Amino acid sequence: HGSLARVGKVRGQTLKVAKQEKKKKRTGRAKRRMQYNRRFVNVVPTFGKKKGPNANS
Template sequence: MGKVHGSLARAGKVRGQTPKVAKQDKKKKPRGRAHKRMQYNRRFVTAGLFITLYLSLSLSYFY
C-alpha cells in the first residue's frame, strides 16, 4: 500500500475557511420543447454565424 498524502486531520480545511455566500435567485431555465430549441440555436445557428464570419474573413485575406 502507498502512503497517504497528508493527514486526514486537515481534510476539508479550505472549504471550512471559505466564507459562506447565500445562493442567488436565478431565472428558471426552459424545459421540454423550449429547451431543445435553445440547444439547437446555441449549437447550430449562432455557431454557424461565427464559422461563416471566420471563413469569410480568412478567405478575404487571400483575395
C-alpha cells in the same frame, strides 16, 4: 495553522457566498429548441478554429 489532524479545514474556512436568484431554465422540449437555435441558426461563418461555448479568454 493550529493542527494537521483536523479535518475539513478548507470546507470550514471557505468564504460562504449564497446563491443569487436567477430566472428558471427551460426544460423538456424547449431546451433542445434553444440549443438548436444557438448552435445552428444564428451562427456566422468563421475561419481558422472554432471557439468553444465557454471560451471567455
